[PDB]
Design an enzyme around this catalytic site. Structure first.
Site, short mmCIF file in Angstrom:
data_model
loop_
_atom_site.label_atom_id
_atom_site.label_comp_id
_atom_site.label_asym_id
_atom_site.label_seq_id
_atom_site.Cartn_x
_atom_site.Cartn_y
_atom_site.Cartn_z
N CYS A 125 0.82 -1.21 0.00
CA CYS A 125 0.00 0.00 0.00
C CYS A 125 0.86 1.26 0.00
O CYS A 125 0.52 2.26 -0.65
CB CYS A 125 -0.92 -0.01 1.23
N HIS A 152 -1.74 1.19 7.03
CA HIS A 152 -2.17 1.24 5.64
C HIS A 152 -1.92 2.62 5.04
O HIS A 152 -2.38 3.64 5.58
CB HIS A 152 -3.66 0.90 5.54
N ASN A 179 -7.99 4.61 -2.30
CA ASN A 179 -7.39 3.38 -1.82
C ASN A 179 -6.80 2.60 -2.99
O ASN A 179 -6.92 3.00 -4.16
CB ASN A 179 -8.46 2.58 -1.06
#
Ligand code: RN2
Length: 220
Positions: free
Chosen positions: A25, A163, A187
């Site tokens: 990520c 994240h 995201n």
């Protein structure tokens, strides 16, 4: 600052990507912020290579699919003198040896800026700079199943983030509880997750999920 910002409308943001089943990520967050700053400079939006970061930025402190940090990615791009395009160095969701080729580099940076750990300062950065790399506590089932509205998780930590994502704007909408402000967050779980791959995360609610705690952007 403005009440509403959306850098997608200004051409700064590539489509939603999918990191797959790799802990990369941080590389998607970093490429997103550098895509925006490169666009600001050159007026050309070019998707960048997360695989380049996963394979090659270990010396800056990143650990591939086992995690990393956007600032280390920005440091790699500076030290390395470049970063390949997504098309030239596509994403495989597994760590391999480094295949960086300077001929296909399309981005550069000269360091990065860490934002003070306050949502007011994050808001000023988003309003004036472009998309911003941030870290959040995303380790909750409510985040997996998010579909619509402003995301608020009472058990979210402001301290323990797991994240990396990309703030592309902020805004408001009327809600039952009158907590109406949100960060617009891209995201890297594909467009089937959330709202086309985006989430509206609670804004000005005590640094919800730590979104202002590790925010930064590359200097181009
Ligand atoms: C998200 O895909 C990953 C999953 C990591 C476990 C597989 N999350 C991160 O990489 C996370 C992002 C930051 C909070 C911005 N960081 C992380 O896991 O860091 C661990 C680590 C720290 C320093 C150097 C290497 C690894």
């Amino acid at each position: 600052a403005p009440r509403s910002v959306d850098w997608r409308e200004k051409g700064y943001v590539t489509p939603v990507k999918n990191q797959g089943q790799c802990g990369s990520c941080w590389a998607f967050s970093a490429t997103g912020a550098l895509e925006g700053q490169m666009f600001r400079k050159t007026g050309r939006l070019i998707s960048l290579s997360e695989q380049n970061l996963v394979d090659c930025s270990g010396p800056q402190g990143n650990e591939g699919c086992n995690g990393g940090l956007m600032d280390y990615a920005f440091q790699y791009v500076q030290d390395n003198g470049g970063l390949d395009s997504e098309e030239s160095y596509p994403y495989e969701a597994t760590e391999e040896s480094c295949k960086y080729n300077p001929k296909y580099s399309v981005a550069n940076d000269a360091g990065f800026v860490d934002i003070p750990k306050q949502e007011k300062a994050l808001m000023k950065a988003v309003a004036t700079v472009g998309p911003i790399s941030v870290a959040i506590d995303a380790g909750h089932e409510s985040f997996l199943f998010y579909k619509e509205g402003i995301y608020f998780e009472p058990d979210c930590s402001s301290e323990d983030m797991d994240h990396g994502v990309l703030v592309v704007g902020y805004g408001f909408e009327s809600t039952e509880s009158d907590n109406n402000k949100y960060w617009l967050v891209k995201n890297s779980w594909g467009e089937e997750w959330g709202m086309g791959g985006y989430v509206k995360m609670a804004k000005d609610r005590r640094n919800h999920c730590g979104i202002a705690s590790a925010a930064s952007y590359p200097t181009v």
